[PDB]
Design an enzyme around this catalytic site. Sequence first.
Site, short mmCIF file in Angstrom:
data_model
loop_
_atom_site.label_atom_id
_atom_site.label_comp_id
_atom_site.label_asym_id
_atom_site.label_seq_id
_atom_site.Cartn_x
_atom_site.Cartn_y
_atom_site.Cartn_z
N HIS A 46 0.82 -1.20 0.00
CA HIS A 46 0.00 0.00 0.00
C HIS A 46 0.86 1.25 0.00
O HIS A 46 0.34 2.32 -0.32
CB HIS A 46 -1.01 0.00 1.16
CG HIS A 46 -0.43 0.34 2.49
ND1 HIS A 46 -0.13 -0.61 3.44
CD2 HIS A 46 -0.20 1.55 3.08
CE1 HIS A 46 0.33 -0.02 4.53
NE2 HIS A 46 0.28 1.29 4.35
N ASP A 92 -0.08 -7.54 1.59
CA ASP A 92 0.36 -6.15 1.63
C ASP A 92 1.88 -6.05 1.69
O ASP A 92 2.42 -5.21 2.40
CB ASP A 92 -0.27 -5.39 2.80
CG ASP A 92 -0.14 -3.87 2.64
OD1 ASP A 92 0.12 -3.37 1.50
OD2 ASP A 92 -0.28 -3.16 3.69
N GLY A 130 3.01 6.58 8.81
CA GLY A 130 4.31 6.67 8.17
C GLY A 130 5.33 5.63 8.61
O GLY A 130 6.49 5.66 8.14
N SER A 183 4.55 2.10 8.54
CA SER A 183 4.38 0.83 7.84
C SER A 183 5.68 0.48 7.13
O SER A 183 6.41 1.36 6.65
CB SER A 183 3.19 0.89 6.87
OG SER A 183 3.42 1.70 5.75
#
Length: 198
Positions: free
Chosen positions: A76, A100, A156, A158
């Site tokens: 993502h 993801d 911010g 991830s």
Amino acid sequence: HMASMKKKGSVVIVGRINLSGDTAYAQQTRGEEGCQETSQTGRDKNQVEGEVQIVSTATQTFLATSINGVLWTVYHGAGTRTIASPKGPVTQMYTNVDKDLVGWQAPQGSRSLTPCTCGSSDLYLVTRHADVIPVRRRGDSRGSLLSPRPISYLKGSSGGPLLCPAGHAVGIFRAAVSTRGVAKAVAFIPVESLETTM
Ligand SMILES: COc1ccc2nc(C)c(O[C@@H]3C[C@H]4C(=O)N[C@]5(C(=O)NS(=O)(=O)C6(C)CC6)C[C@H]5/C=C\CCCCC[C@H](NC(=O)OC5CCCCC5)C(=O)N4C3)nc2c1
Ligand SMILES: [Zn+2]
């Protein structure tokens, strides 16, 4: 029309989380303008160091973590993008939208975390602000924060790591579970999910 169709830029390394000494701290290695030009060319001559990189596209910033010679981050954040490197753009070697997850070959000069084999549930989440947040593992892909905090503090981060007490990689931070804006728990890609992908 096809004559006008544009191409997305590369992910760019713009800093790192320094875990070298007794104090964790973020370092910026490239400013916004240099990030913009490097994203367009895909050619990044900057020296890379450390395990946790701060990375950016034209529109998002997040983290990427080296484990076993692969720089891992979230789909993502990165989508299907290349990453900038001294020799030009580098194509992903792993892409799994279902987890993801994406990965590129770890950049030369990076240091790689070792996958955890401890089976411990006392974890530590490293954020883009170089906070080290205790997390109790609660499942294969989730853990609770010992001290909840607004989701603004996790935004911010991830792609950052969850580590065991011995400093091994246990997972890659993917999402936050919040109630009324307060993060009580996190979800992460377990290292075993990476280890099978590899
Ligand atoms: C496009 O193809 C895709 C394939 C698979 C995929 N898979 C997931 C899980 C996903 O999730 C979205 C992005 C995550 C995120 O925001 N990641 C953090 C982050 O920091 N990103 S980031 O670096 O700022 C950014 C956006 C890259 C630049 C770490 C979050 C920090 C703060 C949270 C802010 C509010 C958001 C609260 C959300 N909660 C949640 O979804 O809970 C789950 C988990 C349990 C099961 C259902 C619900 C949340 O976290 N995300 C929403 N998108 C996709 C997309
Ligand atoms: Zn371990």
